[PDB]
């Protein structure tokens, strides 16, 4: 029972999952609510699901969509999360053409920050793609016909070489592709089928657009390196020149998560007002329970 | 008449740089599909593919591969007029009706195998046979035909993921395996939520046996879905398989032998003389396999 949210539109249907837009009753705040039918999933989908939940609970970064609540039932799982009303970066690109380098950089600095933050938590994404880059109202990055559409162009070469495919360097290769699409408005590696796509990726070479700066081009080369073990950490890339143009006071650095605030007295008292107990507020937050109490508290933060 | 001798009826398919229209061949009333390609928007490699696909299409003459009736060339635009298969995809059919009973899978598989095997005797390999390529006509026979990557990987042979050559007819053999599995199970033997997952399954090469499946059928799956490319049989050898031939005891599936050239049908020759074509140009067009308006008319009178 998700009585504490009021369901508005459907924003997306899946085979065995739907996403609704919803209003969180106590705060009026808009949320996205993924409703998953667990009875329709097989073993490995359940592994992926449980893993996504574990991951998503632990991430707290202004460019990765925030988790506010999880509601479990035997048959159905509900994930209440932040809503990014801006739609996808992929889309934007096709509406607008490439981004000018200045713009690409604002977005890309967010993306690198988000993904590098994951890497420091030993979470690797493993198929970063167009689909996964969403936009908020003010156009900030928020990180999120079958599962293969759009997918191969982001695959790092080791996929096609029988090599292990689990390093953070795999994300590094994808961020490369992302950079390239942002600034050029198309993919650096494409083809009419898997065979063609694979030869391009494995050869690793890509067309330089006439307008591209050389700074940007050097950047791409730090990402799109065939040899997995010879790819820089995102942390090293963060110092790249192009990455810091107009940010001389302000080198892009590893994100530092802020210290927990589980006792905000403004929000505590407000909640006491709604008829929560101070007792349960503490338990839920310290316990990192993601129940309705913690959803309210997090949501009062916006 | 909108192009050569064809009136265009509805649009039955849009592509980014290509369009398929349903059309009526004015002289004969016969329905055709007309692929309208804008060459001005194709890059180098797509042109290579296109020119190859034309060379190939012109040379294939088989009751289960869609027939080519005319090519019309302009600097800017290419028109391929072909046979129209009104029954839609086998992909769709299966989703509408569930798996096929083994008996029915067999009727359609014998056609598919025959058609593909015919290509191999012309040293044409298809290289990305998929669901979308299997079309049905009015009588429900096989006719062999969001981006190019949708539904692609599940049909890929292991060698793609291992850095090996991906060019043998044994590549087709692997996909026919998958095709067989879909027809009788109504689902793919190798799937995943992303490339990584998909590649693990494919390179592992093991697949679920559906409880209802015959052991005949399962033995036949084993002759296709062999990991080692060099260890996969010719379709000519698989044609002899037991399951392939159940209910076809006086009638072992054999390599197709194509009928001999009928470039002199006096019935059709004279009919065309009537429409004011010259005898000499009819023979030139056919003997020279010209795929011009004269040959279109001749084939179309068929």
Coordinates of C-alpha atoms in Angstrom, one line a residue:
Chain A
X1 CA 0.0 0.0 0.0
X2 CA 1.5 3.3 -1.2
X3 CA -1.2 5.3 0.5
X4 CA 1.2 8.1 1.4
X5 CA 1.7 9.0 -2.3
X6 CA -1.0 10.1 -4.7
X7 CA -0.4 8.6 -8.2
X8 CA -0.7 11.1 -11.1
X9 CA 0.5 10.2 -14.6
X10 CA 2.2 7.1 -15.9
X11 CA 5.6 8.3 -17.2
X12 CA 6.7 4.9 -18.5
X13 CA 5.6 1.3 -19.0
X14 CA 8.0 -1.7 -19.0
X15 CA 7.2 -5.4 -19.6
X16 CA 6.9 -6.2 -15.8
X17 CA 7.5 -2.7 -14.3
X18 CA 5.8 0.8 -14.5
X19 CA 6.9 4.3 -13.5
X20 CA 4.3 6.8 -12.2
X21 CA 4.6 10.4 -11.3
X22 CA 3.2 10.9 -7.9
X23 CA 2.7 13.5 -5.2
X24 CA 4.0 12.8 -1.8
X25 CA 1.0 13.6 0.3
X26 CA 2.6 15.1 3.4
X27 CA 4.9 17.4 1.6
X28 CA 3.3 18.0 -1.8
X29 CA 6.6 17.2 -3.4
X30 CA 6.7 15.3 -6.7
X31 CA 8.4 12.0 -6.9
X32 CA 8.8 9.2 -9.4
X33 CA 7.6 5.8 -8.2
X34 CA 8.9 2.6 -9.9
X35 CA 6.4 -0.2 -9.3
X36 CA 7.9 -3.6 -10.0
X37 CA 6.1 -6.9 -10.3
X38 CA 8.5 -9.3 -8.7
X39 CA 6.4 -12.4 -9.5
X40 CA 7.3 -11.8 -13.2
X41 CA 11.0 -11.8 -12.7
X42 CA 13.6 -14.7 -13.1
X43 CA 16.5 -15.3 -10.9
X44 CA 19.0 -13.0 -12.5
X45 CA 16.6 -10.1 -12.8
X46 CA 16.0 -10.5 -9.2
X47 CA 19.8 -10.4 -8.5
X48 CA 20.0 -7.2 -10.6
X49 CA 17.0 -5.7 -8.8
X50 CA 18.3 -6.4 -5.4
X51 CA 21.7 -5.1 -6.4
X52 CA 20.2 -1.9 -7.9
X53 CA 18.4 -1.3 -4.6
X54 CA 21.6 -1.8 -2.5
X55 CA 23.5 0.5 -4.8
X56 CA 20.8 3.2 -5.0
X57 CA 20.5 3.3 -1.2
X58 CA 24.0 4.2 -0.7
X59 CA 24.4 6.9 -3.4
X60 CA 23.9 10.5 -2.4
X61 CA 25.2 12.9 -5.0
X62 CA 23.4 15.9 -6.5
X63 CA 23.9 14.4 -10.0
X64 CA 22.6 10.8 -9.4
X65 CA 18.8 10.4 -8.8
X66 CA 18.1 10.2 -5.1
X67 CA 16.2 7.3 -3.5
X68 CA 13.6 8.4 -1.0
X69 CA 11.7 5.2 0.0
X70 CA 11.4 1.5 -0.7
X71 CA 8.2 -0.4 0.0
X72 CA 8.4 -4.2 -0.1
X73 CA 5.6 -6.6 -0.4
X74 CA 5.8 -10.2 -1.3
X75 CA 4.7 -9.6 -4.9
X76 CA 5.6 -6.0 -5.6
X77 CA 8.5 -3.7 -5.0
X78 CA 8.1 0.1 -5.0
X79 CA 11.0 2.4 -5.4
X80 CA 10.2 6.0 -4.8
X81 CA 12.8 8.3 -6.2
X82 CA 13.6 11.8 -7.4
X83 CA 11.9 12.9 -10.6
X84 CA 14.0 14.4 -13.4
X85 CA 11.5 16.4 -15.5
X86 CA 14.0 17.3 -18.2
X87 CA 14.0 14.0 -20.1
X88 CA 17.2 12.6 -21.6
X89 CA 20.5 14.0 -22.8
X90 CA 20.2 11.8 -26.0
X91 CA 16.9 13.5 -26.7
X92 CA 18.1 17.1 -26.0
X93 CA 21.0 16.4 -28.5
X94 CA 18.7 15.4 -31.3
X95 CA 16.5 18.4 -30.6
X96 CA 19.4 20.9 -30.4
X97 CA 22.4 19.5 -32.3
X98 CA 25.8 19.1 -30.5
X99 CA 26.4 21.3 -27.3
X100 CA 28.9 24.0 -27.7
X101 CA 32.0 23.0 -25.7
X102 CA 31.3 25.3 -22.8
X103 CA 27.9 23.6 -22.3
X104 CA 29.2 20.1 -22.8
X105 CA 31.7 20.8 -20.1
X106 CA 29.1 21.9 -17.5
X107 CA 27.3 18.7 -18.1
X108 CA 30.3 16.5 -18.4
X109 CA 31.9 17.8 -15.2
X110 CA 28.7 16.6 -13.4
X111 CA 28.8 13.3 -15.1
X112 CA 32.4 12.6 -14.3
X113 CA 31.8 13.7 -10.7
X114 CA 28.8 11.3 -10.4
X115 CA 30.5 8.3 -11.9
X116 CA 33.8 8.9 -10.1
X117 CA 31.9 9.1 -6.8
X118 CA 30.6 5.6 -7.6
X119 CA 34.0 4.4 -8.3
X120 CA 35.1 5.5 -4.9
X121 CA 32.4 3.4 -3.4
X122 CA 33.6 0.5 -5.6
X123 CA 30.3 0.6 -7.5
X124 CA 31.0 0.4 -11.3
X125 CA 28.0 1.1 -13.6
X126 CA 29.0 -1.2 -16.4
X127 CA 26.5 0.0 -19.1
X128 CA 26.4 3.7 -18.9
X129 CA 24.4 4.9 -22.0
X130 CA 22.4 7.8 -23.5
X131 CA 19.2 6.6 -21.7
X132 CA 21.0 6.9 -18.3
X133 CA 21.6 10.6 -18.5
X134 CA 18.6 12.5 -17.4
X135 CA 18.1 16.2 -16.9
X136 CA 16.4 18.1 -14.0
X137 CA 14.2 21.3 -14.3
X138 CA 17.3 23.5 -14.4
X139 CA 19.1 21.3 -16.8
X140 CA 21.5 19.5 -14.4
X141 CA 22.7 16.0 -15.0
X142 CA 20.8 13.3 -13.1
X143 CA 22.0 9.8 -13.6
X144 CA 19.4 7.1 -13.7
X145 CA 12.4 -2.6 -28.6
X146 CA 14.6 -4.3 -26.0
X147 CA 17.6 -3.8 -23.7
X148 CA 20.0 -3.8 -26.7
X149 CA 18.8 -0.7 -28.5
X150 CA 21.5 2.0 -28.4
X151 CA 23.7 -0.4 -26.3
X152 CA 26.6 -1.6 -28.3
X153 CA 28.0 1.9 -29.3
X154 CA 28.9 2.3 -25.6
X155 CA 30.5 -1.1 -25.2
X156 CA 34.2 -1.0 -24.4
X157 CA 36.4 -3.1 -26.7
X158 CA 37.1 -5.8 -24.2
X159 CA 33.5 -6.9 -24.5
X160 CA 34.4 -8.1 -28.0
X161 CA 37.7 -9.6 -27.1
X162 CA 36.5 -12.3 -24.6
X163 CA 38.2 -10.2 -21.7
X164 CA 36.7 -9.7 -18.3
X165 CA 34.2 -6.8 -18.4
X166 CA 34.0 -5.5 -14.8
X167 CA 36.5 -2.8 -14.1
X168 CA 35.7 0.9 -13.5
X169 CA 37.8 1.3 -16.7
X170 CA 34.8 0.0 -18.5
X171 CA 32.9 3.1 -17.4
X172 CA 35.9 5.2 -18.4
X173 CA 35.5 3.9 -21.9
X174 CA 31.7 4.8 -21.9
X175 CA 32.3 8.3 -20.5
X176 CA 34.6 8.7 -23.5
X177 CA 31.6 7.9 -25.8
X178 CA 29.4 10.2 -23.9
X179 CA 31.9 13.1 -24.2
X180 CA 32.0 12.5 -27.9
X181 CA 28.2 12.5 -28.4
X182 CA 27.8 15.7 -26.3
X183 CA 30.2 17.7 -28.4
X184 CA 29.6 16.2 -31.8
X185 CA 25.9 15.1 -31.5
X186 CA 26.7 11.6 -32.8
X187 CA 28.5 8.4 -31.8
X188 CA 32.2 8.0 -32.4
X189 CA 31.7 4.2 -33.1
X190 CA 28.6 3.1 -35.0
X191 CA 27.7 0.6 -37.8
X192 CA 24.7 -1.0 -39.5
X193 CA 25.2 -4.2 -37.5
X194 CA 27.2 -5.9 -34.7
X195 CA 30.0 -7.0 -37.1
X196 CA 30.6 -3.4 -38.4
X197 CA 30.2 -1.9 -34.9
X198 CA 32.7 -4.3 -33.5
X199 CA 35.4 -3.6 -36.1
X200 CA 35.2 0.1 -35.4
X201 CA 35.3 -0.3 -31.7
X202 CA 38.2 -2.7 -31.8
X203 CA 40.2 -0.4 -34.3
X204 CA 39.3 2.3 -31.8
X205 CA 39.7 5.1 -34.2
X206 CA 37.0 7.8 -34.6
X207 CA 36.3 10.8 -36.9
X208 CA 37.5 14.3 -35.4
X209 CA 34.8 16.9 -36.2
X210 CA 36.2 20.0 -37.9
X211 CA 34.9 22.3 -35.1
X212 CA 36.3 20.3 -32.1
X213 CA 39.0 22.0 -30.0
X214 CA 42.3 20.2 -29.6
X215 CA 41.8 20.4 -25.8
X216 CA 38.6 18.4 -26.2
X217 CA 40.4 15.9 -28.5
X218 CA 43.1 15.3 -26.0
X219 CA 40.5 14.7 -23.5
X220 CA 38.8 12.0 -25.6
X221 CA 42.1 10.2 -25.9
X222 CA 42.4 9.8 -22.1
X223 CA 39.1 7.9 -22.2
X224 CA 39.0 6.0 -25.5
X225 CA 42.1 3.8 -25.0
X226 CA 41.8 0.2 -26.2
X227 CA 44.0 -1.3 -23.6
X228 CA 41.8 -1.5 -20.4
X229 CA 44.7 -1.6 -17.9
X230 CA 46.2 1.6 -19.6
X231 CA 43.0 3.8 -19.0
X232 CA 43.3 6.5 -16.5
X233 CA 41.2 6.7 -13.3
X234 CA 38.5 9.3 -13.5
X235 CA 40.3 10.9 -10.6
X236 CA 43.3 11.5 -12.9
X237 CA 41.1 12.7 -15.8
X238 CA 39.5 15.2 -13.5
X239 CA 42.7 17.3 -13.8
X240 CA 42.5 17.4 -17.6
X241 CA 42.8 20.9 -19.0
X242 CA 39.6 20.9 -21.1
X243 CA 37.8 19.6 -18.1
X244 CA 38.8 22.8 -16.2
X245 CA 38.6 25.6 -18.7
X246 CA 36.8 28.5 -16.9
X247 CA 37.3 26.7 -13.6
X248 CA 40.8 27.9 -12.7
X249 CA 39.8 28.5 -9.2
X250 CA 37.9 25.3 -9.0
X251 CA 39.7 22.2 -10.4
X252 CA 37.1 19.4 -10.6
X253 CA 37.8 17.1 -7.6
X254 CA 36.5 13.8 -6.2
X255 CA 33.1 14.5 -4.7
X256 CA 33.1 14.5 -0.9
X257 CA 29.9 13.3 0.4
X258 CA 28.6 15.6 3.1
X259 CA 28.3 14.4 6.8
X260 CA 24.9 12.9 7.7
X261 CA 22.3 15.3 9.2
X262 CA 19.8 13.1 10.9
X263 CA 18.8 15.6 13.6
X264 CA 17.9 18.6 11.6
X265 CA 15.7 20.4 14.2
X266 CA 13.7 22.4 11.6
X267 CA 12.6 19.1 9.9
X268 CA 12.3 17.1 13.0
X269 CA 9.9 19.5 14.6
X270 CA 7.9 19.8 11.4
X271 CA 7.5 16.0 11.5
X272 CA 6.5 15.9 15.1
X273 CA 3.9 18.3 13.8
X274 CA 2.7 15.8 11.3
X275 CA 2.5 13.3 14.2
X276 CA 5.7 11.3 13.8
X277 CA 7.6 10.5 17.0
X278 CA 11.1 11.8 17.5
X279 CA 12.0 8.3 18.5
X280 CA 11.1 6.8 15.1
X281 CA 12.6 9.7 13.1
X282 CA 16.0 8.8 14.7
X283 CA 15.7 5.0 14.2
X284 CA 14.7 5.3 10.6
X285 CA 17.5 7.7 9.6
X286 CA 20.3 6.2 11.8
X287 CA 19.0 2.8 10.6
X288 CA 18.9 4.1 7.0
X289 CA 15.6 2.3 6.7
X290 CA 14.1 4.0 3.7
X291 CA 10.6 3.8 5.2
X292 CA 7.9 6.5 5.1
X293 CA 9.5 8.4 8.0
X294 CA 12.8 8.6 6.2
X295 CA 11.0 9.4 2.9
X296 CA 9.3 12.4 4.6
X297 CA 12.5 13.6 6.2
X298 CA 14.5 13.4 3.0
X299 CA 11.7 15.0 1.0
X300 CA 11.4 18.0 3.4
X301 CA 15.0 18.8 2.1
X302 CA 14.0 20.3 -1.3
Chain B
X1 CA 2.4 6.4 -62.4
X2 CA 4.9 8.0 -59.8
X3 CA 8.2 6.2 -60.6
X4 CA 8.9 4.2 -63.8
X5 CA 5.8 2.1 -64.2
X6 CA 4.5 2.0 -60.5
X7 CA 1.7 3.8 -58.7
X8 CA 2.6 4.4 -55.1
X9 CA -0.2 3.4 -52.6
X10 CA 0.7 3.5 -48.8
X11 CA 3.9 3.9 -46.9
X12 CA 4.6 0.6 -45.1
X13 CA 7.9 1.6 -43.5
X14 CA 10.0 4.7 -42.7
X15 CA 13.7 4.6 -42.0
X16 CA 15.9 7.6 -41.3
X17 CA 17.3 7.7 -44.9
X18 CA 15.0 5.1 -46.6
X19 CA 11.3 4.6 -47.2
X20 CA 9.2 1.5 -48.3
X21 CA 6.0 2.1 -50.2
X22 CA 3.3 -0.4 -51.3
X23 CA 2.7 0.1 -55.0
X24 CA 0.8 -1.1 -58.0
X25 CA 2.7 -2.0 -61.2
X26 CA 0.5 -0.2 -63.7
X27 CA 0.9 -2.5 -66.7
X28 CA 0.0 -5.7 -64.7
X29 CA -1.9 -4.5 -61.6
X30 CA 0.5 -6.6 -59.5
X31 CA 1.4 -5.4 -56.0
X32 CA 5.0 -4.7 -55.2
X33 CA 7.0 -3.2 -52.4
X34 CA 9.2 -0.3 -53.4
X35 CA 12.2 0.6 -51.3
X36 CA 13.1 4.2 -51.9
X37 CA 16.7 5.0 -50.8
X38 CA 18.2 8.5 -50.5
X39 CA 21.8 7.9 -51.4
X40 CA 22.8 11.6 -50.7
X41 CA 22.6 10.8 -47.0
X42 CA 24.5 7.6 -46.9
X43 CA 28.1 7.4 -45.9
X44 CA 30.9 5.4 -47.4
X45 CA 30.3 2.1 -45.7
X46 CA 26.4 2.3 -46.1
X47 CA 27.0 2.7 -49.8
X48 CA 29.2 -0.4 -49.7
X49 CA 26.4 -2.3 -48.0
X50 CA 23.8 -1.0 -50.3
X51 CA 25.7 -1.9 -53.4
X52 CA 26.5 -5.4 -52.0
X53 CA 22.9 -5.9 -51.1
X54 CA 21.9 -5.0 -54.7
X55 CA 24.4 -7.4 -56.2
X56 CA 23.2 -10.1 -53.9
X57 CA 19.5 -9.5 -54.3
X58 CA 19.8 -9.6 -58.1
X59 CA 21.3 -13.1 -58.1
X60 CA 18.9 -14.8 -55.7
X61 CA 16.0 -16.7 -57.1
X62 CA 14.3 -18.8 -54.5
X63 CA 10.6 -19.4 -53.5
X64 CA 11.5 -18.3 -49.9
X65 CA 13.7 -15.2 -50.4
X66 CA 11.8 -12.1 -51.5
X67 CA 12.2 -11.7 -55.2
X68 CA 13.7 -8.5 -56.8
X69 CA 11.8 -7.2 -59.9
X70 CA 13.5 -3.9 -60.8
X71 CA 16.3 -1.5 -59.9
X72 CA 15.9 2.2 -60.9
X73 CA 19.0 4.3 -60.5
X74 CA 19.3 8.0 -60.2
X75 CA 22.2 10.1 -59.1
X76 CA 20.3 10.9 -55.8
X77 CA 17.9 8.1 -55.3
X78 CA 17.8 4.4 -55.6
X79 CA 14.6 2.4 -56.0
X80 CA 14.4 -1.3 -55.3
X81 CA 11.1 -2.9 -56.4
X82 CA 10.6 -6.2 -54.8
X83 CA 8.0 -8.8 -53.9
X84 CA 5.8 -7.8 -51.0
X85 CA 5.2 -10.2 -48.1
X86 CA 2.0 -9.1 -46.5
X87 CA 2.1 -11.5 -43.6
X88 CA 4.4 -9.5 -41.4
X89 CA 7.2 -11.0 -39.3
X90 CA 7.7 -14.4 -37.7
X91 CA 8.9 -12.4 -34.6
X92 CA 5.3 -10.9 -34.3
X93 CA 3.4 -14.1 -35.2
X94 CA 5.2 -15.9 -32.3
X95 CA 4.3 -13.1 -29.9
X96 CA 0.7 -13.2 -31.0
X97 CA 0.2 -17.0 -30.9
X98 CA 3.0 -18.5 -28.6
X99 CA 5.5 -21.1 -29.7
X100 CA 4.7 -23.1 -32.9
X101 CA 3.9 -26.8 -32.5
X102 CA 6.9 -28.8 -33.7
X103 CA 5.1 -29.8 -36.9
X104 CA 4.6 -26.1 -37.8
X105 CA 8.0 -25.0 -36.8
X106 CA 9.2 -27.7 -39.2
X107 CA 7.4 -26.4 -42.2
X108 CA 8.8 -23.0 -41.7
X109 CA 12.3 -24.2 -40.7
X110 CA 12.7 -26.4 -43.8
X111 CA 12.0 -23.3 -45.9
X112 CA 14.4 -21.1 -43.9
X113 CA 17.1 -23.7 -44.0
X114 CA 16.6 -24.3 -47.7
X115 CA 16.8 -20.5 -48.4
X116 CA 19.9 -19.9 -46.3
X117 CA 21.5 -23.0 -47.7
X118 CA 20.9 -21.8 -51.2
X119 CA 22.8 -18.6 -50.4
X120 CA 25.7 -20.5 -49.1
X121 CA 26.0 -22.4 -52.4
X122 CA 26.3 -19.0 -54.0
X123 CA 29.0 -18.2 -51.4
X124 CA 26.7 -15.5 -50.0
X125 CA 26.6 -15.5 -46.2
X126 CA 24.0 -13.3 -44.6
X127 CA 25.9 -12.6 -41.3
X128 CA 23.0 -11.1 -39.3
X129 CA 20.0 -13.2 -39.7
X130 CA 17.4 -12.1 -37.1
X131 CA 13.7 -12.2 -36.2
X132 CA 13.0 -9.1 -38.4
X133 CA 14.3 -10.9 -41.5
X134 CA 11.8 -13.7 -41.5
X135 CA 8.7 -12.5 -43.2
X136 CA 5.5 -14.4 -44.1
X137 CA 3.5 -14.2 -47.3
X138 CA -0.3 -14.5 -47.6
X139 CA -0.2 -18.3 -47.5
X140 CA 2.1 -18.2 -44.5
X141 CA 5.3 -19.4 -46.3
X142 CA 8.7 -18.0 -45.2
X143 CA 10.1 -15.0 -47.2
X144 CA 13.5 -13.9 -46.2
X145 CA 14.1 -10.1 -46.3
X146 CA 15.4 2.5 -31.9
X147 CA 18.3 1.5 -34.2
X148 CA 20.1 -1.4 -35.9
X149 CA 21.0 -2.9 -32.5
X150 CA 17.5 -3.8 -31.3
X151 CA 17.1 -7.6 -31.1
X152 CA 20.6 -8.0 -32.6
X153 CA 22.8 -9.5 -30.0
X154 CA 20.7 -12.6 -29.1
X155 CA 21.4 -13.8 -32.7
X156 CA 25.2 -13.3 -32.5
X157 CA 27.6 -16.2 -32.7
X158 CA 30.2 -16.5 -29.9
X159 CA 33.0 -15.7 -32.2
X160 CA 31.8 -12.0 -32.2
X161 CA 32.6 -11.8 -28.6
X162 CA 35.9 -13.4 -28.9
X163 CA 37.7 -11.2 -31.3
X164 CA 37.6 -14.0 -34.0
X165 CA 36.8 -13.6 -37.7
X166 CA 33.1 -13.2 -38.2
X167 CA 32.5 -14.1 -41.8
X168 CA 31.9 -17.8 -42.4
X169 CA 28.6 -19.4 -43.4
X170 CA 29.0 -21.0 -39.9
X171 CA 27.9 -17.7 -38.6
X172 CA 24.5 -18.2 -40.3
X173 CA 24.5 -21.7 -38.9
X174 CA 24.6 -20.3 -35.3
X175 CA 21.7 -17.9 -36.0
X176 CA 19.6 -20.6 -37.5
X177 CA 20.0 -22.4 -34.3
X178 CA 18.6 -19.4 -32.5
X179 CA 15.9 -19.1 -35.0
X180 CA 14.9 -22.7 -34.5
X181 CA 14.8 -22.2 -30.7
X182 CA 12.5 -19.2 -31.0
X183 CA 10.0 -21.0 -33.3
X184 CA 9.4 -23.9 -31.0
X185 CA 9.9 -22.2 -27.6
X186 CA 8.6 -18.7 -28.4
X187 CA 11.6 -17.1 -26.8
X188 CA 15.3 -16.7 -27.1
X189 CA 17.8 -19.3 -25.9
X190 CA 20.4 -16.6 -25.1
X191 CA 19.2 -13.3 -23.5
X192 CA 20.2 -10.8 -20.9
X193 CA 19.5 -7.3 -19.5
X194 CA 22.7 -6.0 -21.2
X195 CA 25.5 -6.9 -23.4
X196 CA 27.7 -8.2 -20.5
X197 CA 25.0 -10.6 -19.3
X198 CA 24.2 -11.6 -22.9
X199 CA 27.8 -12.3 -23.8
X200 CA 28.2 -14.6 -20.7
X201 CA 25.3 -16.7 -21.8
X202 CA 26.3 -16.8 -25.4
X203 CA 30.0 -17.7 -24.7
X204 CA 28.8 -20.3 -22.2
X205 CA 26.6 -21.6 -25.0
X206 CA 24.2 -23.4 -22.7
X207 CA 20.5 -22.9 -23.0
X208 CA 17.3 -24.0 -21.2
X209 CA 15.5 -27.1 -22.7
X210 CA 11.7 -26.4 -22.5
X211 CA 9.9 -29.4 -20.9
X212 CA 7.6 -29.9 -24.0
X213 CA 10.5 -30.0 -26.5
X214 CA 11.1 -33.3 -28.3
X215 CA 14.5 -35.0 -28.0
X216 CA 14.6 -35.0 -31.9
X217 CA 14.3 -31.3 -31.7
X218 CA 16.9 -30.9 -29.0
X219 CA 19.4 -33.0 -31.0
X220 CA 18.9 -30.8 -33.9
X221 CA 19.6 -27.7 -31.8
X222 CA 22.9 -29.2 -30.9
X223 CA 24.0 -29.4 -34.5
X224 CA 23.6 -25.6 -34.8
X225 CA 24.6 -24.1 -31.5
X226 CA 28.2 -25.4 -31.3
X227 CA 30.6 -22.8 -29.8
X228 CA 33.6 -23.8 -31.9
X229 CA 32.9 -22.3 -35.4
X230 CA 35.1 -24.8 -37.3
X231 CA 33.1 -27.6 -35.6
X232 CA 29.6 -26.6 -36.9
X233 CA 28.1 -28.6 -39.7
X234 CA 27.2 -27.4 -43.2
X235 CA 23.5 -26.7 -43.6
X236 CA 23.7 -29.3 -46.3
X237 CA 24.6 -31.9 -43.6
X238 CA 22.0 -30.6 -41.2
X239 CA 19.4 -31.0 -44.0
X240 CA 19.6 -34.7 -43.3
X241 CA 18.7 -34.4 -39.7
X242 CA 16.0 -36.6 -38.3
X243 CA 13.7 -33.8 -37.0
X244 CA 14.0 -31.8 -40.2
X245 CA 12.5 -34.8 -42.0
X246 CA 9.7 -36.1 -39.8
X247 CA 6.7 -36.6 -42.0
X248 CA 8.9 -36.1 -45.1
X249 CA 10.1 -39.6 -45.4
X250 CA 10.0 -39.8 -49.3
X251 CA 11.2 -36.3 -49.4
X252 CA 14.5 -35.7 -47.6
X253 CA 15.2 -31.9 -47.6
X254 CA 17.9 -31.4 -50.2
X255 CA 19.9 -28.4 -51.4
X256 CA 17.6 -26.4 -53.7
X257 CA 18.4 -26.6 -57.4
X258 CA 17.3 -23.4 -59.2
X259 CA 15.0 -23.8 -62.3
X260 CA 16.6 -23.1 -65.6
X261 CA 16.3 -19.6 -67.2
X262 CA 12.9 -19.0 -68.9
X263 CA 13.9 -15.9 -70.9
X264 CA 11.7 -16.8 -73.9
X265 CA 8.2 -17.5 -72.6
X266 CA 6.3 -17.1 -75.8
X267 CA 3.1 -16.3 -73.9
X268 CA 4.7 -13.3 -72.1
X269 CA 7.0 -12.3 -74.9
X270 CA 4.0 -11.8 -77.2
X271 CA 1.9 -10.0 -74.6
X272 CA 4.8 -7.5 -74.3
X273 CA 5.3 -7.1 -78.0
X274 CA 1.6 -6.1 -77.7
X275 CA 2.4 -3.3 -75.1
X276 CA 5.0 -2.2 -77.7
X277 CA 8.2 -3.7 -76.3
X278 CA 10.6 -5.1 -78.9
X279 CA 11.6 -8.8 -79.0
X280 CA 15.2 -7.9 -79.1
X281 CA 15.1 -5.6 -76.0
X282 CA 13.2 -8.3 -74.0
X283 CA 16.0 -10.9 -74.6
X284 CA 18.8 -8.4 -74.0
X285 CA 17.2 -7.4 -70.7
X286 CA 16.7 -10.9 -69.4
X287 CA 19.8 -12.6 -70.7
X288 CA 21.8 -9.6 -69.4
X289 CA 19.8 -9.8 -66.2
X290 CA 19.3 -6.1 -66.4
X291 CA 16.5 -5.5 -63.9
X292 CA 15.1 -2.7 -66.0
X293 CA 11.5 -1.7 -66.8
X294 CA 11.4 -4.5 -69.5
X295 CA 12.5 -7.3 -67.1
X296 CA 10.2 -5.9 -64.4
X297 CA 7.3 -6.3 -66.7
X298 CA 8.4 -9.8 -67.8
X299 CA 8.9 -11.1 -64.3
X300 CA 5.7 -9.4 -63.2
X301 CA 3.6 -11.1 -65.8
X302 CA 4.8 -14.4 -64.1

